[PDB]
């Protein structure tokens, strides 16, 4: 529990905000890449079926 407090606190060895922000920037880039890949294989209508843009977080 002392280590659990340390990882949460401001003196944590892990910069949680930096890693969380990069995960968000990595995820929406994947959404753009996968959506564009499907737009070429099949139509835009089919792409909207399988990768909806409404659902983000």
């Amino acid at each position: 529990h002392k280590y659990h407090h340390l990882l949460t606190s401001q003196n944590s060895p892990i910069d949680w905000n930096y890693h969380d922000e990069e995960m968000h920037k990595w995820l929406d880039s994947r959404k753009t890449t996968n959506y564009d890949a499907m737009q070429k294989k099949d139509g835009t209508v089919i792409a909207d079926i399988h990768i909806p843009k409404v659902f983000n977080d």
Binding site: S9, D20, M23, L27, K31, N34, M38, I51, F55, N56
Partner: peptide, 20 residues
């Protein structure tokens, strides 16, 4: 502070199912 981090991770988890 802990629950702010926990709720941030819950949002990331749902986003992973929407990226294809």
């Amino acid at each position: 502070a802990i629950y702010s981090r926990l709720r941030s991770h819950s949002d990331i988890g749902f986003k992973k199912a929407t990226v294809g």
